[PDB]
């Protein structure tokens, strides 16, 4: 049975919520105030640790508003189901304008994507 | 219930998205406009479509491989919720020093209906060790 | 039942491996020495061809380390389940420093994501949603 368990690592953390009833993702909020330099990057802590089920992973996905309005998008973003460290969001600034993330800003959305993980079979012929 | 992909044309310029091979992941998205993605910049390209995909999925607007190598084009963000009924636009980022020209009808992205789970969020005191 | 078939196209190829029992991705290694130029791009060969099952595709996904240490992101990355050509990794460099790729370096990770591929139908109107 699917689950999404979240542990607050500080009092500043915001428990993720979905934005609409059928929404794909859980909104993630910044636990800090941080500059994202023009044509540069920032690593934004959520002060959360998580667990998601085997047969899935948590993808840190971009919010469309951040991307369209501010040319900000998300690098990396693959959180394994057994990763128990703090969840941070890597933002890339694809513009010549400096940007600033404020404490509590929603900076990404977490999507729990279904996957398969079979053992690899090496072959001489794929078909 | 069986999966579905319904599309509604918002103008005559919209093109029904079509897959590219019988096992292909995604449905090709065509531009409804003439436009451009400026060098080192971005654009929102209308498809003039509204869509519906099933609960337990979302529609991901994903980059085409050819455009990524030839024009350094990427999709800046492409999460479309299963309950999103607004117009579908494609956000393109141009990671090169030359403009990318868009003519109406041009394929600019592909849509992939990804399976997900959406359980309730549960705050906990401790997580298991791995 | 899911599978992941891999064919090596040369001796330089490395069978993709998963790091831990619950890891999402299979690490992909470069088959070449190469460079991703500052603010530029490169197509890095793996010298692999692959097959994944119907109802999935293989997503070429970024490694977190390369993203943060080198501003490297993966472009493109949608590998169809019936694509039988060579698998190359498209890297974008979002920094002003060249990124060197050495033979055997891990440059991405492959994730076999579950999808649906229903027959698309045009309709006159869609349901409006409480949103
Ligand atoms: Mg995905």
CATH number for the domain spanning B87: value is 2.70.40.10
Phi, psi at C71, each rounded to 5°: 55, 35
Total Cβ atoms within 10 A of residue A58: 23
Experimental method: X-ray
- A90/C64 touch (CB, cutoff 8 Å), yes or no: yes
CB-based contact C63:C49 (threshold 8 Å): no
Per-residue exposure over C83-111, b if at least 16 CB sit within 10 Å of its own CB, e if not = beebbbbbbbbbbeeebebeeeebbbbbb
CB C29 within 8 A of CB C46: yes
Q: Which domain holds residue A80?
A: 1-127
Question: What is the C-alpha separation between B13 and C26, in angstroms, rounded?
Answer: 41
Name residues whose C-beta falls within 8 Å of residue C30's C-beta, 6 or more positions apart in sequence: C44, C45, C46, C89, C101, C102, C103, C104, C105, C106, C107
Counting the structural domains of chain A, the total is 1
Please list every residue in chain B whose beta carbon sits closer than 8 Å to the beta carbon of residue C43: 69
Chains that touch C (3 or more CB pairs under 8 A): A, B
Burial class of residue C127 (count of CB atoms within 10 Å of its CB; 0-12, 13-18, 19+): exposed
Partner C, chain A 9-48, Cβ-Cβ below 8 Å: 20-22, 39-41, 43
Ligand 1 centroid – CA B12 distance (Å)? 31
For C16, the closest of A43, A57, A120 (CB atoms) is: A120
Q: Which element (helix H / strand E) includes B68?
A: helix B65-71
C92 to chain B, minimum CA–CA distance in Å?
8
- For residue C53, what are its two tokens? 């099952």
State whether B63 and C77 contact (CB < 8 Å): yes
**Which residues of chain B neighbour C40 with C-beta distances below 8 Å?**
72
Single out the residue of C51, C43, C42 nearest to residue C79, CA to CA: C51
Edge-to-edge strand order for the sheet containing A72-75? Answer: A41-45, A88-93, A72-75
What CA–CA distance (Å, rounded) separates B54 from B8?
Answer: 15
CB contact under 8 A, A64 and B120: no
To the question of whether residue A100 is assigned a binding role by annotation, the answer is no
Return the residue matching tokens 């039988």: C84
Terminal Cα-to-Cα distance of chain C (whole angstroms): 37
- The alpha carbon of C59 is separated from its chain's Cα centroid by a whole number of angstroms, namely 5
């Amino acid at each position: 049975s699917p689950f999404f368990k979240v542990k607050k690592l500080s009092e500043k953390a915001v428990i993720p919520t979905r934005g609409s009833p059928l929404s794909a993702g859980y909104d993630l909020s910044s636990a800090v105030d941080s500059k994202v330099p023009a044509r540069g990057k920032a690593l934004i802590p959520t002060d959360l640790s998580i667990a998601v089920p085997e047969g899935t992973y948590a993808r840190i996905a971009p919010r469309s508003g951040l991307a369209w309005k501010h040319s900000i998008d998300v690098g990396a973003g693959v959180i394994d189901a057994d990763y128990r460290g703090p969840v941070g969001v890597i933002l890339f600034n694809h513009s010549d304008a400096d940007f600033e993330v404020k404490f509590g800003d929603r900076i990404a959305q977490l999507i729990i994507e279904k996957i398969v993980t079979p053992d690899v079979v090496e072959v001489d012929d794929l078909d």
